[PDB]
Amino acid sequence: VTAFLGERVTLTSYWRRVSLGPEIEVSWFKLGPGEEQVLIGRMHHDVIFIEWPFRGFFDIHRSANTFFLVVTAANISHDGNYLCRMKLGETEVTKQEHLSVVKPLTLSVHSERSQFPDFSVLTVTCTVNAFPHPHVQWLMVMKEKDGSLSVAVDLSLPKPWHLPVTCVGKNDKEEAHGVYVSGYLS
Amino acid sequence: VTAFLGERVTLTSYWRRVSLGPEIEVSWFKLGPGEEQVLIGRMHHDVIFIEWPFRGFFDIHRSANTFFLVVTAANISHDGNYLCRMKLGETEVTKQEHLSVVKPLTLSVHSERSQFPDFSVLTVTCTVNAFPHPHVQWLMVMKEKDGSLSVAVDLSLPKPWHLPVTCVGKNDKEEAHGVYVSGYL
Amino acid sequence: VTAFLGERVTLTSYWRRVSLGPEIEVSWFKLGPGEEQVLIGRMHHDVIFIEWPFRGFFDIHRSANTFFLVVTAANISHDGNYLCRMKLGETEVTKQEHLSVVKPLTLSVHSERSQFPDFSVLTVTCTVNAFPHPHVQWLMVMKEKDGSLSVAVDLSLPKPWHLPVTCVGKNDKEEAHGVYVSGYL
Amino acid sequence: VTAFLGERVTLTSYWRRVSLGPEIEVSWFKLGPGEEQVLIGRMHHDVIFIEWPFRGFFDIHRSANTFFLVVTAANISHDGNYLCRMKLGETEVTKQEHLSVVKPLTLSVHSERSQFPDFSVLTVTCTVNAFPHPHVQWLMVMKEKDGSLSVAVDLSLPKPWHLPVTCVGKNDKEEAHGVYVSGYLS
Amino acid sequence: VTAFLGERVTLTSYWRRVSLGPEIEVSWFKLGPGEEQVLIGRMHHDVIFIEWPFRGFFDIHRSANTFFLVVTAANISHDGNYLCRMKLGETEVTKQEHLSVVKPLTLSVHSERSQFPDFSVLTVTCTVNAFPHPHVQWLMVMKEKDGSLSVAVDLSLPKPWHLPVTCVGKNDKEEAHGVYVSGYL
Amino acid sequence: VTAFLGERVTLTSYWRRVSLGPEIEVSWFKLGPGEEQVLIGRMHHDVIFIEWPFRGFFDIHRSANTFFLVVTAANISHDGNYLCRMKLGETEVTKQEHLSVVKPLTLSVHSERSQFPDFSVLTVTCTVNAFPHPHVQWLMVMKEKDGSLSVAVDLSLPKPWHLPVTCVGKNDKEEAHGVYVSGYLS
Amino acid sequence: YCSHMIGSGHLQSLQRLIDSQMETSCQITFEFVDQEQLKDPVCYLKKAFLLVQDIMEDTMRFRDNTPNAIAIVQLQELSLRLKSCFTKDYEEHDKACVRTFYETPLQLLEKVKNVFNETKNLLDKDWNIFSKNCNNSFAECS
Amino acid sequence: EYCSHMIGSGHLQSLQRLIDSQMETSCQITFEFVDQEQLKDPVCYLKKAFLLVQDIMEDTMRFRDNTPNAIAIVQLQELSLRLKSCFTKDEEHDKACVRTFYETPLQLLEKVKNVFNETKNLLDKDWNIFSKNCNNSFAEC
Amino acid sequence: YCSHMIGSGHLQSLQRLIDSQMETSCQITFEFVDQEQLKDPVCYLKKAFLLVQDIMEDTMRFRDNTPNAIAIVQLQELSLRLKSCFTKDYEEHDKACVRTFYETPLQLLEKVKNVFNETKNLLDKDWNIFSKNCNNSFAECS
Amino acid sequence: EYCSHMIGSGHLQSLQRLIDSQMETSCQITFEFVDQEQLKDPVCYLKKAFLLVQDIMEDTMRFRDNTPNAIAIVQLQELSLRLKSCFTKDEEHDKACVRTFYETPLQLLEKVKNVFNETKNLLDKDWNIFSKNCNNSFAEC
Amino acid sequence: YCSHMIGSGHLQSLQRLIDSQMETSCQITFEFVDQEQLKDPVCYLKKAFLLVQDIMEDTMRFRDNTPNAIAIVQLQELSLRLKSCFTKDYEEHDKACVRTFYETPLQLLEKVKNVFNETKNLLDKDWNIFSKNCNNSFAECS
Amino acid sequence: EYCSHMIGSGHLQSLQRLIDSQMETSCQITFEFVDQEQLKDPVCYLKKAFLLVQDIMEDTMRFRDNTPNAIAIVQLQELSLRLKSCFTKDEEHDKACVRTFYETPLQLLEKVKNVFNETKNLLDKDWNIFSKNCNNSFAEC
């Protein structure tokens, strides 16, 4: 599924035979790099136990034959693939889900004028912070602590400044513009 | 005069008669509210001394009948009125100048979708941090550490989301636009 | 219900009629003293939103006419009364549950010999840190950061030291003993 | 001698000929590893001087022919052998003392129940902190900042819990017991 | 008695009759202002116990009818009056001693030339940090962390600078001189 | 020139032809080690710009044909040689100046008596902190954070103390004395 | 005359409800008599029965005019009569000796059937049985 | 020709008898079924829906053996076993066009009833209807 | 009669002052009419002229009894007469439409000459020109 | 003999006419000149001062071409060109004994006038005066 | 008549006490006249002597009925007489010109002997010697 | 036989004369002696105690030469020199069974007096008493 930053999100799985729910030994995993499988939590007969690392970030609960892996609050780290393995006796069944996390882009524009040799060259700056794919462009990459990605671009305008000038920022299909119209002084 | 943040700036005062420069006892002040005086520095016969509080932030130098007050690098604190006291014997003349410091506005746009009762209400946010007069409004005040003023505004869009939407931010005459065109989903 | 420290726990509420589950506007609260209400989270038509203060500590999920409040990992703070407000149109029903959190008691024994006026008086110490009701007594209150309660008791033995001596500690029904058998010298 | 943690303790030495006291050049030492001799302090004609390292921790004073090395407050570091060297002119005499420091043991018991797959397996823990020789045992090693030694042991009890259960802790001849009698719930 | 900073020091008290030493219940106090009593330590039958606050700073030991209070290393705090209470049965005798701690004075000289209105006035500075009574004066109070007292004095010399100039610093009877002979320029 | 610590000081340069001032492209430099040239600031047509490193520590201004490099407040680091390069068109002229920084010396004297074997040996100490050349001497090197130089000397006096005793401190041509006259006790 | 107030045909319909419901993991919350707290065989049933009737309205529900929906209305009609074979005790004890269960609907029906079956059985022996003032036996519950 | 007369009116009735019988609750369950939005053509929708219904009944609809409803299911599976011949098969698109529904059992039975009823009505109209190979329609999913 | 109040000999002396001053980078601060704020050609001059006279005393100075010092006193004498060819306007506006310049002395003199030259020119056309109440045109300045 | 009659009284006058003409201001400028304190001998002071004055006028004293003052400068440079013969030269000490003065133009012209006037008076007294080689005096600097 | 108040036999016994005590490092605290503060030879002794008597009771002690214990009682008896050969001065000065010493018992006895020996010597010369009002000489001490 | 008549009554008296003479004080000193608790047998206790007393007097009891007490000590050492023959020796257990006492000189003299007095009385009873070799008793220490 797709979910935004900080939002609650749920991945689901279930047992074919509707007669059985608690009898199923459910266990969710977190697919790290290299097909690594990090055990998030387990459930069986309504006795749930989350591994301490994920504790508070993930929870499991059931309703009939359906099993839910609830993300209390999503962060960029959580973007990836998850795995639910259900077992009744010796037979097992598996379901795979891809949770794509998104951080709505933040397009910021600002300028500052040259201090030498004169005060004629104005340089506007367009900076766009988003996830997973930020992109900035004038019409004529750093990692954040959040796990997001910031990227920025500069434009130099000799006087006469040919304002207005537009920069286009976007996160895949998401998009926004920033237009510097006029300076403070003239 | 007017100057931007970080830039070098100079206020000037002068003696009426062009005959005298060094003889004048120049002294500059920083006018707090109530037109209260805080001594920045003094000059006389080309011997200058800046008070240690303002040392490195302000300097004084002379050319003929003119007297310069140099702001090495201006910050928001400096915005205000300055007063020069020029004394020669029993006569004293005062000249007043106004330094307006400006921080180029920074317009930012960012959105979020409601998490309750549903995911249908998109609230886009327009934030403008400038000085001295930031302003934001949608087309349809917090104080920072640097001394500037941040202000923001939210616009709620029920489904279907009528996009594009434009927000107009500006700092007095300075101005810029922000347009949210489309969501990610 | 009753649950130990760190464990996962669930309080439940439900709608009287089994016909309706999603339609009910569920909302859970944390009852401070004076039966004051602090909003934990809400649920409606399976759209859940927990307030940021309780985010990660509490969750809400539904099954049929039942409504669960999940405590991810319980701490002493959580001990108290909880209240569920279920609203359907003009009618509203309230159900109240009590979560008793428990910290397994930790009984410790330790001794010291008097340093004045002589080294003849042995004072053995029995310390029991538990919750909610630690208790210590010899056979013949301080608050911690985790929110638990430590209590201790001293027993003085003049020479000759009559050993063994037993101290009985307990947390309500939970119980353990500590016995000092002999000194080092 | 033997002294407990934090207590004041005194090692002594003296000069055979009772006529002389101040005339004797007294000097106490601290036997480090490898027969190392760390000068603690000196005394002669009632002029005492403690090396700055030991300053406040050790003091020297005299009464007639007897010389005293006073430990203001003992710590685990002080456990070891000391040396008093007395000299009159060219002839010297030496006395050796062993100060054994002791930290009364602290026996602590506590339990916690399994959180998965059920809540049936109760694990009691017996921890004993003492010096110099802590030892823990159920009836069916870490170093502290004090310089003491902590050691602990666990016991797993499947339901039915065969309580009561006893653990025996002791510091050489010192000894104490810890018995878990009943749980909070049943 | 009198002793310098950091040095070892001993105050003494004694019993009138030479027959008795151990039998006497000795106890030393530190007299704060108002002759208020703060217990340092006790001794009886050669069993000593110092209160934990003074532990390591003070010790008590006996020789015959004499009773010693040993200051391991003296600091300014220790300067003041001390009181020994010796009790035998129903009789009690008190003996009082005064410990004067001294910090050797540190005389320092340093100069600066005026920066306004000209560079013609040389101001030499004489600083003396001692205890208990620092004193400075030119020949023509601040408290430190260690507990000592710093004091200084300035001497202004218009051009031409009449050098040498001598400043006399002293701590009661202790004394030292500082002489500025010539400038760098 | 010569200037003391913390004082305001000015190095100057000028253009031969008195007709021209603003037209000249002035630029001051800081001669680091190895004939290195660190650009302090520039000026042309009364548009001044100081490199951010030196910002606040140095400033440039003009009066007619003369150009000034003002040191707001001098520190020991500033001691060295500076360079002013003036250019009109393709022709250039250079001027060189040596700013010698000085920290007025601070002569301090103090004593402490032996604590063993007796209290008879008094050791007076003479310490002189100055710049650039501190020097201490009794009549019978460490670097500070300021960039200054501290140096000190000790003198041991067996009783009878032959007081008074004098120590001579000096910074090149600057000079001062410290005399210990009498002890506190006798 | 209360011994044959509960017809055999009633248990027949209830068995059908059970054997006509779908088997699943589904589970719900419903009120019911706390068996452990109230152990007296007679008062337990008297209370269990009265409780089932309030529960039945909103718990056991079917589409209007279906065979099962009719079965339910018949069970309610049956109670309106039985209202006489029981004596009022006290109002404090309503919601006393009662607890809550989170279990499958089939397990509920099994409880309801069991309650009707045993109730009928006891009535056959003595029709005066449920005139007992159980107030005292209700008091122990908490 | 023979397909028209297979799905008896009696079969639809029994399905309704199961539905009318079910007890109403908030209970919801997860089951596999054809995504109506993903594949919108009505004729092909019934075609695929059917193949799922056969695997569905085994795991989804369960009753105590020999009850009127348990027997009712057996009559439907038998009916389905012979019916497979009246349908042309296009198996690669299995696991495609299937979506999971979290819905009440009644909503399920209503979906199954809807399928059988729509089927019967459509078959009556045309016995030759199901010659189409909607492999292309499956690709749309 | 004001048309020939300003003699040609006056501009001659002023030109000499200019062509007799030394060329340097030197620069000073002096008051003068803000040209941008006050654009009206007639009122600009009327104000520019009156301003030059106050400025002249302390701005344009020479050693006493020198050819140039005399030239200055002659220019002042000239004004004492012109005081009649001008009408008083208002006192608020003194120091209105005035700004400050930091420029070389030669550039100042060029401004002064320019002001005298244009002033004389306008007077030649109409001697009644500077009787205008420019109060309204002064008001725009700030 | 011929040196005595070169520096005309008329030349000193014109220099004064330039000085009297200059406008009085606080303005100050930096120019090269002989350090009077560094080299105190009056006879040698004029000797060196002169060599600087020739390079000085070019950069220091400037007037619009053909003005009474611009022409006045030309008369002084020409005068100086021929005068160099009446002076003995000792060039190594160039850049030595020269100091920079930050002073008003009037103070400068006064220094130049002082030099020419002192020169004329001294030459009148002795035409043979400037045979001295003060190389030693320069070393004193 | 005071010249022969102190018998020679008294010093004989004191010498025995000294030559009959054991030599050790042992040291005690006792009061005694500050020799430096009170330097006057006559008043120093007068005060030293009176002081020794108070000191003697609790300082110089022996087993009852021993040769030395008797020697002590004899010295006390001797004083009871001498009480007349001395004149009262003032009470302020008791505990003035007195200090404390921490030294061996033998060193104390040497001081006591020395005090008795010199005292006897001075009395032999003049029996009226210790009638002096030393109040003034006591005042200097501190 | 001859051992019985060595320790004279007169010797015990002189020891008492030293004790009676000593001045009473709080003063305490450290000296070596036999640990009574460590070795409890009375006969062997005197046996070992004696060997220490001989080394003891030299360092412990000191008086100015030729005083009644200094001479008294000499009479005791001489007495001891000849006495060593009346005792059998078992030297390895030297440094064993000896403990340090921090006690007043009077307590010491009382210990020494006690030894000589107990000795005399025991010798009088039996001159052959000290044939025992308590090496075993020393091992008990």
Ligand SMILES: *[C@@H]1O[C@H](CO)[C@@H](O[C@@H]2O[C@H](CO)[C@@H](O[C@@H]3O[C@H](CO)[C@@H](O)[C@H](O)[C@@H]3O)[C@H](O)[C@H]2NC(C)=O)[C@H](O)[C@H]1NC(C)=O
């Ligand atoms: C903007 O410019 C102003 C000055 O116009 C700055 O304020 C001044 O900041 C300096 C230090 O940055 C202050 O001096 C300091 O004094 C403390 C002791 O109180 C001392 O420890 C420091 O070393 C330093 O000397 C000064 O007092 C302060 N205010 C004034 C009026 O002088 C300000 O920091 C600049 N930046 C901003 C963001 O405002």
Ligand SMILES: *[C@@H]1O[C@H](CO)[C@@H](O[C@@H]2O[C@H](CO)[C@@H](O[C@@H]3O[C@H](CO)[C@@H](O)[C@H](O)[C@@H]3O)[C@H](O)[C@H]2NC(C)=O)[C@H](O)[C@H]1NC(C)=O
């Ligand atoms: C026991 O559980 C309670 C929650 O039931 C914990 O109390 C909560 O702790 C969190 C952080 O641990 C608090 O939120 C914090 O807010 C601050 C700003 O005020 C922010 O900087 C942090 O990042 C964090 O978001 C929360 O306010 C607090 N209380 C409540 C009622 O929510 C508690 O920490 C747990 N542990 C213990 C030992 O009590």
